[PDB]
Amino acid sequence: MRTADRKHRVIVCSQQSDVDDEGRLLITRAGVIQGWAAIAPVKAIRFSQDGVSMQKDTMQPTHDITMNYNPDVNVSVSAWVYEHRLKSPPRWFKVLSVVNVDECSRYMKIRCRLVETSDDVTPPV
Amino acid sequence: CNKQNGVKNILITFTDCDTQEVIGPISHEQPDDTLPTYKNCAWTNTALTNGYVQRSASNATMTLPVVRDLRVPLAFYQGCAQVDVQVEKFDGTVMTLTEGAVVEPEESDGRSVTMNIVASEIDELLPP
């Protein structure tokens, strides 16, 4: 993939969770990586105004993310991708799996599932 | 039409035959789908030969399962005080039984008793 295809600014996030004292749980999403990436859709999306995607299986990836490989980072089962745009609301991607493209260790292919896309999401800290 | 069969309200009044005290419980609740059962004719019949019959005097009986109310003692349900019961079905029928007496008490576990009440006569209301 030509390096001009990477035209999205993403923030790869690892989530931490802690129980709320009143009885709930809270998921803190902090950024660990920020760079240029190229996204591509592999499925349509049901939006259900207020943004939350209405996918049923919650395990079929909808977007494929291509970015630069990094041998020391270990993209977990609990990684997120916060992609921010200029005049469109930000989007929260939840990773579903990674692909080491052709095992050349040049790019990672992160099968992700659109979580939602609205102007009232919590940016990462 | 004949609106769906079933009980709607069951009122019970205890009066102890020793201290003459009265209790007006706040009506009881059916424990299951079985309904209170009734028999009004106070005269039983016996089959003689060739169509005849011996009409003798008897009682009016009533069988009522109810959940024990956790304020009135259980003894009052096992045939230990005079009861005044009043039932109301869904189709409008209301049957009242006054100054009755519980006969043949059967063992109960503490939450659902089955009363075998005997009385002189039960009146029926026959919804309009």
């Binding site: 802690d18 709320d20 709930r24 749980l25 809270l26 998921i27 803190t28 999403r29 049901r46 259900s48 207020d50 939350v52 995607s53 209405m54 996918q55 049923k56 939602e116 919590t122 990462p124 800290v125 | 039409c1 004949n2 609106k3 769906q4 079933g6 709607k8 869904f90 189709d91």
Partner: protein
């Protein structure tokens, strides 16, 4: 009301579900089947409680002979569609979409409105099952009721 010993699905939706929750604006849409259309019954304001007949069957004697106390049993379901609302904290914390949703308030006051209706007209239904399931930002609360009655013919 017609059918003095029964209540139609329109009557159920407007007299039991409507005097219930005021956040639904009487959107108890009477439908034929609950799954007759998932692309149509998903556009209304998120509450849009649905009511529809699942299957009609008998409850014992059902022969049609003019006088046999023809017994009938209608199995319908009521599907709540409630918008889930996440709890945000001002430290970067949030509650995921798979958090527990309190259906207890819903079943309680729905039963209460049903109790009041039974007291006012003498009509009772049977509770069978309660199922909950979510999808995205919507929670489906599905009650399955069953109503017994007798079909009174007309002369």
């Amino acid at each position: 009301l017609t059918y003095g010993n029964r209540v139609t699905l329109p009557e159920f939706a407007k007299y039991i579900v409507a005097p219930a929750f005021h956040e639904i604006e009487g959107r108890a849409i009477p439908v034929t089947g609950v799954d007759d259309d998932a692309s149509g019954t998903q556009a209304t304001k998120l509450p849009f409680v649905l009511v529809g007949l699942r299957q009609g069957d008998t409850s014992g004697p059902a022969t049609i002979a003019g006088n046999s106390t023809i017994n009938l049993r209608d199995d319908f379901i009521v599907e709540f569609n409630m918008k889930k609302e996440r709890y945000r904290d001002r430290k970067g914390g949030e509650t995921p979409f798979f958090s527990y949703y309190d259906y207890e308030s819903i079943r309680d006051r729905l039963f209460n409105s049903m109790i009041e209706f039974s007291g006012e007209h003498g009509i009772t239904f049977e509770f069978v099952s309660l199922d909950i399931s979510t999808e995205g930002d919507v929670v489906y609360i599905e009650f399955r009721f069953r109503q017994n009655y007798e079909w009174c013919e007309t002369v």
